[PDB]
Design a protein around this ligand. Structure first.
Ligand SMILES: *Cc1c(COP(=O)(O)O)cnc(C)c1O
Lengths: 139, 49, 491, 420, 28
C-alpha cells in the first residue's frame, strides 16, 4: 500500500530483471552502437526512478487515513518515514552499480560523461535525508 | 487434432500469466505486436551478430 | 496439557497452523501482471483528453474545485472495473447452502450492467457467513420471528434511553449473558456500529491502543475516533506484541514522558482474511504480566469454534471472566443482524449511559430480536448443537482435501474460513468467472484489501453443507485448479 | 538503560477501564415498554398515549406494512449473511433503491444498514484532511462524528443564522487571495441539517442555495427529521421551499423516523453516490439491511405516494399542539409551528444542570400517572461539543385523534405550574 | 584505458559514498 511495496517478497529480483528487460531490448536496435546502448539504458532507468518516486505524490488507491499521504511523494513514505531501512538503501546502491558498468563501457568519454553523470546526480540529490520536505520552485 | 486444441491452451495460459486476460481485446493486439516485433528485431541483430 | 511455550501460554490442544511461503517463480510473474495493468492504466487515462462513459460532473452551474482526486481513483477504474463482474452478484433466494443468483452481463465492458431474464438456479455458494446454518425460510426456528412481526411492528421508532425500550430487549440481554458466561451484556443495532461507537467510550485522551496489523474497519475506525496513540504489532507475533508492550511501559508519550493512562489490546477471534485463530493463551498470560486490558472480538468466533460453540474462549478451555470485553456479532453465525458487548456488570452500566448509541441511535428491530433468541435456544437446547459437531467435520474434511491436491491454504487447521491462494491479478477475474460457469460461487479478494502478492480467494464453510454437496465442490476445484494451474504448494 | 531499571518501572498502575459512574445517582430509569410502542402503549405498567415515538405517519401499526414485511420474511429469511458486496444484495435491495430515487426525483439512492452510520460514514468519503467544512453548531450527533472521522478543519457558524456564515466564507476569500495554489485544491463544503432535532427549527435554504455559488462550496443536507412530512408529497425541506433537488449535492436521511424501518439512505446525483460504494466505510464492511426491513420501507413508500393527504393533516395538527401551548409560566416553547418534534425546555434556568435536569424530570414523571407519556431528551455531556439546555420533547403523530390531543395540552399546563 | 582525468576522481567519491551509506542504520 505504497508504504510497503519495496519490502515485499521478490520485488528486488523483479527490479534487477526489469533493467535487463530494458537493456536487452535497447541492445537489440539496428541503427545504434554499444556506447549509446549503455548511455541510453542509464537515462531511461534514472528517468523512471525520478518520475515514479520523486514526482508522483499520493496513492493510486484510496487510503483510509483520510489522505495523509496526499502531499508526500512515493520516496518520502517508504516504510513509514524511517530512512536507512533494508530496502530504501538498495534503491540508492542500484543507480551507483549501474553507473560503474556504464563507466567501464563507453570508455570514459567527454560528452557521455556529461549526459550519464548529471542523470545520475538527478536521482541521488532527492535521496538524501536532509532534503525531505523541500520542493524547489515546483510541485 | 488434439495437438492443436492443447496448443490453444498454452495461449490461454499466456493470457492469465502477465495479465492479458481482462485487457479489453482492442488493447491485446497492441501488446501482442510489441512482444513479436521486438523478438523479430532480436532475430535481425541475432542473425548478424 | 500441550505447550507452556515461553510466555506462560498454556495450550490444552495442539495448535498446528501453517502459512506457506510464496514461491520465487510465481512472485516474479505477478509484478508483470500488475506492470501491464498500470502501463495500460496510464495509456488509457491519457486517451481521455478528448471527447465506457464517465460520470460527468455537472456543468450547468458548477466547475468549482473538482470533487475527487483523480489519481486516487486509479485502481477503481483500471484494476477493479476490469473484473468487477464478480463480488456484486444479486441473489434472489435465501442465502443458505444453495442460492438462486440472478444472471447479468455487460455490453459496456463492466462500466454498466443489465439483468437479462435469468435466475441461475441451485448454486452452492461458499462465500456467505452461514456457519451454523440458521438462515432458512422453513422450520420452527424462524416461525417464532413471524409471531413477533405480526404484533410489535417492523421497527422501534425511538432510542434506548427514550421511550423505545421493549421487553424483548431486556429479554435478549439476559440471554446473551448466560450464553457467553459473563455477568451482563448489551445488544446493539449493527455490528460495525458496536466497535465504532464504544471504543471511544472506553479509552480517552492519554491512552494507548495496541492493535493488530489486520483487524477490520470496525476496530480501526473505533480507534481513530478516540484520540489515542495507535501502535501496530505484527499478525500473531507474540514476540512483537511483548516488545511493544514492554517499550510502552518503560517509556511514555512521544512528546512528554508521563506514564500511559491505560492500555488495551484489540485482537479478534478468527481473522476473516487469511483465516487464523489468534494465539489467545499467549495473550491472557501476557496481559497479566504487564497489567494491560484485552478487547476480544468474537465476530467469526461465536457459534463456530469449540464444541457447544460459545466462541474461541471455550475453544482453548479458558474462562470468560479473564477477558475484559467480548464484542461479537449476530450476522455471521445466528442468521440475524446486530451485535453485542459483554463483560463485568460494572462495565455494562457504564456503557448503558455513556455509549454513543444508547442515546442517539435506534435499537434493534423487534422481529430480529426473536431470531437471535430462538437461535440461541437451539444451541443450548431442531438442527441445533449437532451442527457444531458437523461444522467440526467439514472443517477437517475440506481442509486436508484441498491441501493434498496441491493447493496452498493459509490459516489454522480448525477455522471455518478456508483462504485459497490466487496470486496473479488476472487469475482473480478468471477464477471468479470460471467457478460460476461450474455451478459454484466464491468470494475473491483483490489487491488493495490484501498485500501485493497475496490476492487470495475465500471459502466460508457451513453446517448446511452436507457430504454430497461438499464433495461436488471439491470436484470443481480439481478442474479449475488444474485449468488455471493454481497448484503453487510443494506438498 | 540499565536492565535492572526496566524491572523497577514494572510496578506501574493503570487507571481502571470504567470510572465509578454515578454523579449523585443517575441510573436514568430505562423505561421498559410492554408490547409494541404503539399509540396506546403501556410504559412501566401504566397505560398511556405516547409523545416520543417518531412514527409521525403512523406506519408502524399499519396492517399493510406488517403484511408486506411478513410476505418477504417467508421467502428471504430474517438476516442477510454477509456484506453487500460479498453475496448480500437481494432483489429488494435493488427495488428499494429504485423507489427512493424516484420518490426524491434524483438519479441514485444508496442504502446503509443503520440510521446513525448513514452520515457518519458519508461525510468522511469526501472531505479528507485538507477540506474546510462549515457546520451549523447545533447539528445532530450523527453529523458530529463524520466531522471527527474526516480530519478536516471544521468552522462552526451560529444556529439558523446567516451573516455569520458569510463571515466565515469571507475568511476564505482572504485566504484565496493569500495563497492561490493552496486554495485551488481545498474543495470546501457546507453541512447543514434541514430540520433540527436539537432545536426544532428550519434552516433557510434559499439564502443558502444562492450563497453556495458565490462562494463555491457544496451543500450536504441531512434531513433526518425533515424527511417524511414537510411538503405536499413528503420530500422534505427541498419541496417546502420550492427549489430544485439538483441544487443540493447530497440529501441524507434515515428510514427510522416516519417510516418505521431501520437504516438510512443518501440520495443524489450519480456523480456523487457511486463513490460511497468503494469508500463508504460502513457500507462495505457491515452486513446489509435485512430484507424484512426493506419490504416494510417499500410499503411505507407506497402509502406515502398513494395517499399524499396524510402530510396535510400532520401540518395543521402541529398548528393545534403548538398554538394551544404557548403563554404559560415556567417553560418556553422553542420549536417551530411547522416541525412535528418540539422541545419544551424551561425558562428561568437554575444553576447546576444536574439539578435542572432533575427538576424537569418531575414534570414528565408526575404526568405519566395521568396516561400522558413524554420523554426527557437525553444527551452526552462531555462529548457533544455544543450542547443544548435540558428540554423535553412533545412529538405528535397523525394517529392522535384531537380530542385526546387537547387533553395533553391541558394536563401539561396543569403539572408545569404545580412543580415549578 | 585505465585513465581519464576528472572521472575516476568522481567515481572514487561514490565508491566511498556507498560504504558510508551501507553503515547508517538509523533515523526518526
Ligand atoms: C463481520 C464483521 C463485522 C460486520 O458487522 P455486522 O454489522 O455484524 O455485519 C464487524 N466487525 C468484524 C470484525 C467483522 O468480522
Amino acid at each position: 500500500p505504497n508504504t510497503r511495496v519495496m519490502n515485499s517478497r521478490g520485488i528486488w529480483l523483479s527490479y534487477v530483471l526489469a533493467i535487463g528487460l530494458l537493456h536487452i531490448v535497447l541492445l537489440s536496435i539496428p541503427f545504434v552502437s554499444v556506447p549509446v546502448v549503455w548511455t541510453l539504458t542509464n537515462l531511461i532507468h534514472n528517468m523512471g526512478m525520478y518520475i515514479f518516486l520523486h514526482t508522483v505524490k499520493g496513492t493510486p488507491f484510496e487510503t483510509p487515513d483520510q489522505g495523509k499521504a496526499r502531499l508526500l511523494t512515493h520516496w518520502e513514505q517508504m516504510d513509514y518515514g524511517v530512512q536507512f531501512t533494508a530496502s530504501r538503501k538498495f534503491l540508492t546502491i542500484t543507480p551507483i552499480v549501474l553507473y560503474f558498468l556504464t563507466s567501464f563501457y563507453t570508455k570514459y568519454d567527454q560528452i557521455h560523461f556529461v549526459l550519464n553523470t548529471v542523470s545520475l546526480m538527478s536521482v541521488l540529490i532527492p535521496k538524501l535525508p536532509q532534503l525531505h520536505g523541500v520542493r524547489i520552485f515546483g510541485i | 487434432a488434439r495437438a492443436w486444441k492443447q496448443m490453444s491452451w498454452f495461449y490461454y495460459q499466456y493470457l492469465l500469466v502477465t495479465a492479458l486476460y481482462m485487457l479489453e481485446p482492442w488493447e491485446r493486439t497492441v501488446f501482442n505486436s510489441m512482444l513479436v516485433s521486438i523478438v523479430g528485431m532480436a532475430l535481425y541483430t541475432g542473425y548478424v551478430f | 496439557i500441550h505447550h507452556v511455550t515461553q510466555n506462560g501460554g498454556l495450550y490444552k490442544r495442539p495448535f498446528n497452523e501453517a502459512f506457506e511461503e510464496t514461491p520465487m517463480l510465481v512472485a516474479v510473474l505477478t509484478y508483470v501482471g500488475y506492470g501491464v495493468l498500470t502501463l495500460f492504466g496510464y495509456l488509457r487515462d491519457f486517451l481521455r483528453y478528448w471527447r465506457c462513459h464517465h460520470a460527468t460532473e455537472r456543468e450547468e452551474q458548477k466547475d468549482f474545485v473538482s470533487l475527487y482526486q483523480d489519481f486516487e481513483n486509479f485502481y477503481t477504474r483500471n484494476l477493479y472495473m476490469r473484473i468487477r463482474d464478480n463480488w456484486n452478484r444479486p441473489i434472489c433466494s435465501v442465502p443458505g447452502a444453495r442460492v438462486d443468483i440472478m444472471e447479468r452481463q455487460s455490453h459496456d465492458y463492466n462500466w454498466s450492467f443489465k439483468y437479462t431474464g435469468n435466475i441461475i438456479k441451485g448454486v452452492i455458494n461458499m462465500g456467505s457467513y452461514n456457519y451454523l446454518g440458521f438462515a432458512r425460510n422453513t422450520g420452527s426456528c424462524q416461525e417464532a420471528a413471524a409471531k413477533v412481526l405480526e404484533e410489535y411492528g417492523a421497527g422501534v421508532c425511538s432510542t434506548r434511553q427514550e421511550i423505545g425500550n421493549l421487553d424483548k430487549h431486556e429479554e435478549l440481554e439476559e440471554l446473551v449473558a448466560r450464553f457467553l458466561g459473563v455477568e451482563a451484556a448489551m445488544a446493539y443495532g449493527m455490528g460495525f456500529a458496536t466497535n465504532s461507537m464504544n471504543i471511544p467510550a472506553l479509552v480517552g485522551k492519554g491512552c494507548l491502543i495496541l492493535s493488530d496489523e489486520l483487524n477490520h474497519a470496525s476496530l480501526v475506525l473505533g480507534a481513530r475516533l478516540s484520540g489515542a496513540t495507535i501502535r501496530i504489532f505484527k499478525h500473531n507475533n507474540m514476540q512483537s506484541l511483548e516488545k511493544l508492550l514492554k517499550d510502552a511501559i518503560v517509556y511514555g508519550q512521544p512528546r512528554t514522558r508521563r506514564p500511559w493512562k491505560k492500555i488495551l489490546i484489540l485482537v479478534e477471534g478468527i481473522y476473516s482474511m487469511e483465516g487464523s485463530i489468534v494465539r489467545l493463551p499467549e495473550v491472557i498470560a501476557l496481559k497479566k504480566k504487564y497489567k494491560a486490558y484485552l478487547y476480544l472480538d468474537e465476530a467469526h468466533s461465536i457459534g463456530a469454534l469449540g464444541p457447544t460453540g460459545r466462541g474461541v474462549v471455550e475453544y482453548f478451555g479458558l474462562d470468560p471472566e479473564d477477558v475484559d470485553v467480548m464484542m461479537g456479532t449476530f450476522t455471521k453465525s445466528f442468521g440475524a443482524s446486530g451485535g453485542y458487548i459483554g463483560g463485568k456488570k460494572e462495565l455494562i452500566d457504564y456503557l448503558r449511559t455513556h455509549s454513543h448509541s444508547a442515546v442517539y441511535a435506534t435499537s434493534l428491530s423487534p422481529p430480529v430480536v426473536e431470531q437471535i433468541i430462538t437461535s440461541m435456544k437451539c444451541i443450548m437446547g431442531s438442527l441445533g448443537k449437532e451442527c457444531v459437531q458437523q461444522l467440526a467435520e467439514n472443517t477437517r474434511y475440506f481442509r486436508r482435501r484441498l491441501k493434498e491436491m496441491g493447493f496452498i491454504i493459509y490459516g489454522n487447521e480448525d477455522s471455518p474460513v478456508v483462504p485459497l491462494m490466487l496470486y496473479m491479478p488476472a487469475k482473480i477475474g478468471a477464477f471468479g468467472r470460471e467457478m460460476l460457469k461450474r455451478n459454484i460461487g466464491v468470494v475473491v479478494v483483490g489487491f488493495p484489501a490484501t498485500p501485493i502478492i497475496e490476492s487470495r480467494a475465500r471459502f466460508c464453510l457451513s453446517a448446511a453443507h452436507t457430504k454430497e454437496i461438499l464433495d461436488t465442490a471439491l470436484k470443481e476445484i480439481d478442474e479449475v485448479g488444474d485449468l488455471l494451474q493454481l497448484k503453487y504448494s510443494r506438498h | 538503560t540499565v536492565k535492572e531499571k526496566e524491572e523497577l518501572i514494572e510496578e506501574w498502575q493503570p487507571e481502571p477501564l470504567v470510572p465509578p459512574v454515578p454523579k449523585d445517582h443517575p441510573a436514568l430509569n430505562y423505561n421498559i415498554v410492554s408490547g409494541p410502542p404503539s399509540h396506546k402503549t403501556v410504559v412501566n405498567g401504566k397505560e398511556c398515549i405516547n409523545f416520543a415515538s417518531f412514527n409521525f405517519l403512523g406506519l408502524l401499526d399499519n396492517p399493510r406494512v406488517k403484511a408486506a414485511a411478513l410476505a418477504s420474511l417467508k421467502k428471504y429469511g430474517v438476516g442477510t449473511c454477509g456484506p453487500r458486496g460479498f453475496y448480500g444484495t437481494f432483489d429488494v435491495h435493488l427495488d428499494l433503491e429504485d423507489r427512493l430515487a424516484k420518490f426524491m426525483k434524483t438519479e441514485e439512492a444508496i442504502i446503509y444498514s443503520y440510521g446513525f452510520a448513514t452520515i457518519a460514514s458519508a461525510i468522511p468519503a469526501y472531505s479528507k484532511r485538507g477540506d474546510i467544512v462549515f457546520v451549523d453548531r447545533a447539528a445532530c450527533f450523527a453529523i458530529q462524528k463524520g466531522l471527527q472521522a474526516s480530519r478536516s478543519d471544521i468552522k462552526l457558524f451560529k444556529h439558523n443564522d446567516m451573516a455569520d456564515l458569510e463571515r466565515l466564507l469571507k475568511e476564505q476569500e482572504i485566504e484565496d487571495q493569500k495563497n492561490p495554489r493552496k486554495a485551488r485544491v481545498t474543495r470546501r463544503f457546507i453541512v447543514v441539517e434541514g430540520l433540527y432535532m436539537n432545536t426544532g427549527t428550519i434552516c433557510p435554504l434559499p439564502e443558502l442555495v444562492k450563497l453556495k455559488y458565490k462562494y463555491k462550496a457544496r451543500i450536504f443536507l441531512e434531513e433526518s427529521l425533515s424527511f417524511g412530512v414537510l411538503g405536499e408529497h413528503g420530500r422534505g425541506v427541498t419541496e417546502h421551499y420550492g427549489i430544485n433537488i439538483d441544487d443540493i449535492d447530497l440529501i441524507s436521511a434515515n428510514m427510522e423516523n416516519a417510516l418505521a424501518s431501520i437504516g438510512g439512505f443518501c440520495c443524489g446525483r450519480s456523480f456523487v453516490i457511486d463513490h460511497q460504494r468503494l469508500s463508504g466505510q460502513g457500507y462495505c464492511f457491515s452486513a446489509s439491511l435485512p430484507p424484512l426491513l426493506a419490504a416494510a420501507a417499500i410499503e411505507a413508500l407506497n402509502i406515502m405516494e398513494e395517499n399524499p393527504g396524510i402530510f396535510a393533516v400532520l401540518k395543521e395538527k402541529c398548528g393545534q399542539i403548538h398554538k394551544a401551548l404557548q403563554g404559560i409560566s415556567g417553560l418556553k416553547v422553542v420549536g417551530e409551528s411547522l416541525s412535528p418534534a418540539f422541545h419544551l425546555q424551561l425558562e428561568e434556568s437554575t444553576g447546576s444542570r444536574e439539578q435542572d435536569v432533575r427538576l424537569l424530570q418531575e414534570i414528565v414523571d408526575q404526568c405519566m400517572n395521568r396516561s400522558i407519556a413524554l420523554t426527557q431528551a437525553r444527551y452526552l455531556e462531555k462529548e457533544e461539543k455544543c450542547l443544548p439546555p435540558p428540554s423535553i420533547r412533545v412529538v405528535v403523530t397523525v394517529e392522535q385523534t384531537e380530542e385526546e390531543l387537547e387533553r395533553a395540552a391541558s394536563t401539561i399546563k396543569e403539572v408545569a405550574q404545580a412543580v415549578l
